[PDB]
Symmetry: C4
Subunit: 66 residues, 4 copies
Amino acid sequence: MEKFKEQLLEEVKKIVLETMTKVMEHLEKWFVTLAEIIITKSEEKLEELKETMEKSIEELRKEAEG
Amino acid sequence: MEKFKEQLLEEVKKIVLETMTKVMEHLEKWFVTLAEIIITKSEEKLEELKETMEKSIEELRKEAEG
Amino acid sequence: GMEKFKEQLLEEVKKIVLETMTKVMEHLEKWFVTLAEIIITKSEEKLEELKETMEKSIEELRKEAEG
Amino acid sequence: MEKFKEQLLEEVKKIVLETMTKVMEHLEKWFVTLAEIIITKSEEKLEELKETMEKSIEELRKEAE
C-alpha cells in the first residue's frame, strides 16, 4: 500500500506547509505592528496591535473549523 | 478505497489548524506583554513575561497527554 | 501485522512536521535578528527590511506548498 | 475497521501538540533574551541571541532524524 503511503504523506506535508504559510502572514503583521510600537512606544499602537491579533485569531478560528 | 483517505486527511488538516490557533492564542499574550516591556522598560514586566510563558508552555504540554 | 504500517506512517508524519517547523523557525530567527536590530537602533530603513523579509519568507512558503 | 483511523487520529493529535510545544520552548528562550535586550541595548545580548536561536534550530534539525 505504498500508493497509500505516498499520496497520504506528500499531501500531508503539503497541508502542514500551507497552514504554516498562513500563520506566517499573520505573524508577519504582528511583527510589523510590533516594530511600529518599538519605534514609537504608543499605548495607541498597542491597542492597534491588539485589535490586529484579534482579527488574526478570528481568521484562524474561522479557518480551523471548516 | 479512497473515501477513507479523504476522511483521514481532513481530520488531519483540522487537527493542525486547532493546534496552531491554540499556539496563536499563546503568541498573543507573548506579543502584548512584549509590547508593554517595550513601552515601559519594566524589569517587573520582564518577570511577568517569563512567568507567563512558563505557565503557557506547561498548559501546552498538558494537551499532548492523550 | 497492521501495526507495522501504522507505525511507519505516523513516523513520517512526525518527520514532515519536524522538517517544516525547522523551516519556519529559520524564517522566524531571521525575523528576530532584524527586529532586535530595530530595538537597538530604531532605524526605519530596518522596518523596510523587515517588511521585505517577511514578504520573501511567505513567498518561499507559498513556493514550497506548490510541489 | 475504522478503529485504525481512531488510533491514527489520536496519535497525530499527540504528535502535533508535541512538536508545537518543542518549538514553543525555544521561542520562550528567545523572548527572555529579547526582553533583556530591550532593557539593555547591548550588542552582547545581540550576538548571544544569535547563538541561542542557533542551538534551537540545530537541536530541531537533528531531531527530524
